[PDB]
């Protein structure tokens, strides 16, 4: 998948991570490895790393 949906809320704690709400839909073009994936929110237009285990496919 390249589009995902958040299963839980996440509040950012640093400079590089993205805040999002449950049900928020995210574009994630590179999601092969790592605990953190670069995500672009299709709602807010905000972009940042998100925890790989907080999302499910949505495309």
């Amino acid at each position: 998948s390249t589009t995902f949906v958040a299963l839980y809320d996440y509040e950012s704690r640093t400079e590089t991570d993205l805040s999002f709400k449950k049900g928020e839909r995210l574009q994630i073009v590179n999601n092969t490895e790592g605990d953190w994936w670069l995500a672009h929110s299709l709602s807010t237009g905000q972009t940042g790393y998100i925890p790989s285990n907080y999302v499910a496919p949505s495309d």
Side-chain angles (χ1 to χ4, degrees), residues 2 8 10 18 34-35 42 44 51-54 56:
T2 45
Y8 327 90
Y10 178 71
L18 173 66
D35 294 349
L42 299 172
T44 68
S52 61
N53 57 354
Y54 275 48

Side-chain angles (χ1 to χ4, degrees), residues 1-10 12-14 16-20 23-32 34-37:
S1 298
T2 45
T3 302
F4 294 77
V5 63
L7 301 160
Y8 327 90
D9 308 317
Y10 178 71
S12 62
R13 295 116 88 198
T14 190
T16 57
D17 56 338
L18 173 66
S19 298
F20 54 85
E24 190 161 331
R25 299 180 75 198
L26 310 170
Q27 172 181 298
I28 311 188
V29 305
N30 298 129
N31 53 77
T32 290
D35 294 349
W36 294 90
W37 293 344

